[model samples]
Target: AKKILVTCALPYANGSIHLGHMLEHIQADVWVRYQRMRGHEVNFICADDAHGTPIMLKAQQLGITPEQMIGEMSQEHQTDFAGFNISYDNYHSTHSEENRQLSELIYSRLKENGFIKNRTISQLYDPEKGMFLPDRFVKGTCPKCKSPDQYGDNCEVCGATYSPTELIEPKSVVSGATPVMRDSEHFFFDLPSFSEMLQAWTRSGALQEQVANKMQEWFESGLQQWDISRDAPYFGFEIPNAPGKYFYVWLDAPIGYMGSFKNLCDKRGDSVSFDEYWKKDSTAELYHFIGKDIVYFHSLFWPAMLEGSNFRKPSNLFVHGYVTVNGAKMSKSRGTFIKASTWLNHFDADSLRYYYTAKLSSRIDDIDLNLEDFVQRVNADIVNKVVNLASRNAGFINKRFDGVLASELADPQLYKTFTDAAEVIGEAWESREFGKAVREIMALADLANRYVDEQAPWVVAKQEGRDADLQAICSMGINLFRVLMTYLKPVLPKLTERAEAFLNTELTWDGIQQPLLGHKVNPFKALYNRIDMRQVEALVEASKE
Candidate 1:
């Protein structure tokens, strides 16, 4: 029984939860649910990344205060995540008082330790917007590759990192006007001071080998002091003793993890201790699920901040790739950029959940959502195979045998086939190799379907004196179906709940070790329906707005 705390990258409050966001949340939710099923004590927490210039500007355009904007967006975000069954124990926000206190505490600690430097740096200033433009707010040709339309910080095409001033022809994305260089005294975290420590942490198995390989470039390039303060007109906690400056969004964003856990403990009372998980050198395991784009922030700045603040660093960081639709970027004009609410409007959440798990793996590879393939895979694997096992056999027990499973196993080896597969599937889930687990599950499903086909139980039901054999065959099939649902409990939780009701027993990992014999079950009902193309088309059409 491991004490675990899991978190996904906080969703920015500026936008809705899109498929791109769901990719990470769903991936984390699957592992959290699996760990719970394995009898581990797990707490999953997430928050809205509510600070930054973007939030302030968006609120201004909407004629609302930043607080009200985030408040409304937080509720909307919770609704969307709940709709998708993303189980978060405490979905707090960075704008909370807890976060403000912790941010101040950490900042004060770093300052006292002489790790905070006030430096006057020249940055691109947007005159029309009347603000200092962050790296994302400027667009220009890349300095390294001369690639067009790259962000101020890096080039998406060539993967080059450079300053906004280095852009060949920089323009403010906020105003579409030429930006001017302006000098401002900003607070910087002495990131270079922790370079040696970060280097050791990178190679300490906290990151994937490939992700560690990616970090090698930054280590060789030499770490630079990270800017931890943004100028006024930002929607974030104000820096202590610095009246007009605010903590940069990146600085406070990862701190939200600690603030959120503290918030949870406060709400739950003294029984749950926050220090047990976050104290320096605490034994509890900490895991972060994030996307590959922000690997630099989580890998470098996050750990450095925690180390300087005398808190435990994360135990593992699981990085995943972006989500594409139909082999291309999710484009709003192309009607492929679907929202979580829009998806819930047309289809059940489990369909997409299952589809994602089938594609996701431990590696950070982009997963594409091909609408046609989604329809076919959902129909073939879910409707025709896994659920069908329960549907066909459950009817035999319900209608003919009065809803009671047979007293004993007919062929114990057949049951062992599924139970044996559980060990491998469990390992896959433990290692975050969900795609492999799904593949193993589908293979088991195929074998079980073949078993039902060869038994021809449907024919035996018609013959006299064959009722005993029919019960055994159908009972065996139901037991196999139960095992499949147990394996898939993490991926398709709603369906697993439906399975629990139909089978009239709790769906737990230990339950799979013993088959239900001489047991009464609820009458059979359709667990799920196949996805239709019309629904997919309607979702795409709705995304056009």
Candidate 2:
């Protein structure tokens, strides 16, 4: 019913797709799948942020061009996402021609609108490497606390901030050479000029309460001109009419969201949709799903960039917190850090998906993997509670009744109760109260299980001349399973496929009022299996090496 564009934060090309990164993609994938299930036009977009200083340097170290490295990383990232059943409409790269054109176009428009400024600034440069050193690439003693070997612009020991030039005896991490200050012409986006507009939007009730509160604090302090250009020898789009200058990676990275959608349109020959979705005043709603660490970019710089370029800004920014393992940050030495690709080897994708959905909400609170809890919860709720409904009742339908459901629900009142829950459950999903949704679903699962237990179909099977009673009871339980699966379809895609086959009916948001009567369903494989701690141990053990 609505035209919506959704994007996950672009994964940097330098790192592998790990469980820490999976939280955002999984959360976005769940929301997108639900939107499509609701019959909305949704475009889910993402791209590899392939242009950066580290990426450029890493490629040279690996005996390959920057293009070659990003290409390989893109393959791995896509493969990992696909393995998790992330239904991305289009996955692209920031290093593409489409991104280049959009970046230049946005910059030129900003310049024409007088939102661009040029100034000369001094920064640390590595003479031996013949390149400018970014903050992280320079290290020296902390000027504030006199701590030795403090890296970058911030000191960890004293929690003080200063320019890299303030560091004592600064040296380049890349070449270990004593760095010297050099001046260069830097292009800046006049972000401070748009502070009033940004402040008004911050109070516009479109953002989450916490996000709005956070943005208010930023405005009280003030905004500065954002450096939009990097000097030469940078791996990014060239500034228009400025050959030796390139757009900073952050400037073009978010623009990749637009570029990705544009690429999709050109591929599908839908040339008009781009303007329909991105113009200054469009009917479509755009949203970005990103981590809390980058709120400054999406909440501040991103919206301002779009406004200055005469484009539609994001309708909302859904921010989430970091992913931790076992109540602590993921540690490689402790084997808590696991890659996305390694996960499929130990467990199915739906397990992690459901686990996260149960823990997630509309807040930016940190979510923990808690490996032991992961194993217990999946086996307890999914395996023993929800799946047990079909697995317990399906045998009677297939083996005895020619795979046909009952002509009528044994207890019509109970069926109505399940159908009545549609409103509240739908609201939870729509409002991004995912944990509440999961809670409501499992509560229904408990009732369904209790219904089956009261029926005592196993005892009814042994009584003479009670075959009809047994079939009716089993069919009632299966119908209950149908409704629960319909509610969970968005969260578990693979399980939904198995359920659709087993029930011989497609799940729909509004189709639940009509129950399956006298319908035939196919025999199904194990819908879901129980997982043990051994798999968790294996996962952690493998991650160590």
Candidate 3:
């Protein structure tokens, strides 16, 4: 078995977990759960990106300390993730003591290796707030497309990137006042120094093909030194030797992955070695899941920092696109930008999880959460198709057959067909083609349901001495149901647990290969409830608040 370390991009602590954030976490969690079920030694970790100007400003606005704000936000994030069945091995915070130490360590290594430089860079100054404003803190018309209300770094409308100074009539988002230019002696990492390394690494399977093509654009434009330090009034760990300056949130955010793993190891004592997974030449694999917007940070600066710090670069990055609601960007006014809590308040988490997987694929494509489509799909695929097999077959097994399976095979060839599909389905899941895997499993469910319909076991129930034949037919249905649930265990774990209870056996890949003949089973219970349109509407209504 391979030793794997996996992480989702740290969620920013400035807000609650929304469907947008769940898109990444749920994607990563599904992959991690699959690896575990496949019997691999996988360590999946994530953390709250609990530092930056947003946290500081938010805390001040809420009349609390940054520490207090982050602490509460971390708990809320944990609760939301747990509610969705995100099985993170260790969910931590970037503000932990471990992160502070590692951040300093990595920074010191970069500094000692001559990759750190200081220069006076001009930045927009929020005079009313008595601080320098980051790109996100300033908003104005986009110089490229004349789009109004654009952020300083990039235009949302035109997708053009530019410096804050390039904005037309830039104003401080903090105080809504016109901003003036000021210079600060901030530190920058010599990113150009690692241009050759980054260029080669970008094509080395660490990035998707389209993402690699995008990186090529940045390469042709030339990589500039990265600003790694933030000025005073930032809510993050201070630079070791530079008082009042803190590491940029992006700089320390990825390190939180390592810090979180370190924290997990400490809790588990010496049972596991952190170095085996992070050391420069370690044999284990590392994977990162991130959104398309931050590809440059993860693929460029992050790996460069790791190389400079004498640590292993990521083995691969799984990039995905944003989540839209009804073919448009999630809009607060339209009540489409629903939070995780809001969705959970009205519907089962598994319903959303199932819907997202059916739409998810290995490609980085924006997924639209059409409410009507969601209700219809979940009710039809999961409720009517997937669960119907078990509900139809289990009742007969419990009432007529003493909760026991048949002694002989009903149709050995058909059973083999279902078991053989696992190889193909497993390959799809391993490669992160979850949509393909779900499609394959549902096809098997379709076949199984068709078989039951043709046999018409309810018709045989009336024939007096055909009791044994009736038992065998329903037994075949129960076994077929088990096979599909085994394939779906990673995506719908709660339903898998219910299947395990009803079968009176563990659900695993090996168990699916053999039919459950003559084994007593438990009484069947409702696996999942059908989704109603009202629940979806109520969720949207609640999100408006």
Candidate 4:
């Protein structure tokens, strides 16, 4: 049996999980769940990247220590993810003592290999606060792009990526203090020396094509020795030998993966062989899922750290595009930027999952959840078409067939239709072409509705001088319902339970590949219903708020 280890990017605890954030989490969750159902040994691990300047500032604003702040936010983050049915084998934190030990071990390896070095670099320091202003702590006009209201790191207006030091007229946002240019002696990793090795490993297809391409682009701009420590007063693991210094959050974030693995090994009573999974090449498959916003950090900087530190190369990296509302970036005032909890509160979680899976693909395409499109597509396709097939026909069987299993589908055409639907739709999902899977699902639904309409089961009941004709109507509906449930098991798990209960048949994919009995059918209510357009309109209007 092959073992797969999967991870989603750590959502910073500073903010709530937004729709865009949920996209990545949902995609990973669905994939992992399906893998488990298929009988694979998969370990999913995630952690809250709770140590950063944002935590410090938020704590300060709340008149509490950073410790108090991250603890509360991390719990809230876990609550939200669990509510969405994102089951993780382990959800740890970067601020744990376990993480500190793991980080020290990795940092020691780099130190022993002569990859660790120290340097005095100029950093913006707020004298009033007696602290070094991390990028998030400062705000100013962009020096290169001349964009105002920019963070210390980059300009959102022109989308120019730059370091915090590059911003002009920078002032500390935390204290409203004028920050002075000060030289801070901090630890820096010698990254450029391993650049050639990284290029070779990347080009050898050790990593995914998209990841390699992005890494190459960043290297073209030149790689530098990265500062890997901050001077004092940060909520993170401190440097082992150095006082008043903490390892940078980015440096410790990936290390949290290994720390979580150690925690898992302890919990499961497994041998602590995490090194085999991460340090050895052939034992494990490492997959990282992150958004495009942090592409540069993961693809280039993270890879370099691995090479210099002699850690496992990332096997695959998945990137996703941003969320847009009505084909535009989500704006808060417009109510376009939505919290994930808000959506779950209003509608079924499966609705968003199904919509995103349809809109997203393995390729680098941006997905827009145009509120209008979300309403129309799900209602027209899933409820009206697919689920309606069972509701319209199965209710009649409950009234007439005494809730029993129907006879085998006798019509050769109907049997063949069910076989074709299962085979084609299953193949699409296996290929990971989600759009194709959705279209194939709808095609089967379309056939089911057309067959139901042409062979009008209602008319047969009224005229049922022909018992065979009535049997045919019942057989067609049950078989179609069984096939639809099998194909849709991955997207809508809860609904499948309801469907299986109604059919008096197991919901496994095997049952869908053949004909069902013609006469026995269990009682069932409306499987799916049309959404009130008013409710959908209200959601869109709320999103605009």
lDDT of each: 0.92, 0.93, 0.90, 0.77
Top model by lDDT, which number? 2
Estimate, for each residue in 354-421, the C-alpha lDDT of model 2 and write its tens digit. 99999999998999999999999999888988899999999988888988888999999999989999
Q: Once superposed on the true structure, which residue ranges of model 2 sit more than 4 Å away at CA?
A: 141-150, 154-162
Q: Sort every candidate by TM-score, greatest first.
A: 2, 3, 1, 4
- Model 3: per-residue Cα lDDT over 31-98, one tens digit each: 99889888899988999999989889999989999999889989999999999999999999899998
Query: Which pairs clash in the backbone of model 2?
Result: none
Instruction: Go through the candidates in order and give the C-alpha RMSD of each one to the true structure.
Output: 3.2, 1.5, 2.7, 3.1
Candidate 4 regions off by >4 Å? 139-171, 204-211, 272-276, 307-310, 412-417, 420-427, 514-522, 540-545
Once superposed on the true structure, which residue ranges of model 1 sit more than 4 Å away at CA?
Answer: 124-130, 135-181
Candidate 4: tens digits of C-alpha lDDT, residues 233-310: 777888888988899898899888777878888778887557667774647777887888887677767766676667
Itemize residue pairs with steric clashes in candidate 3: none
RMSD of 3: 2.7
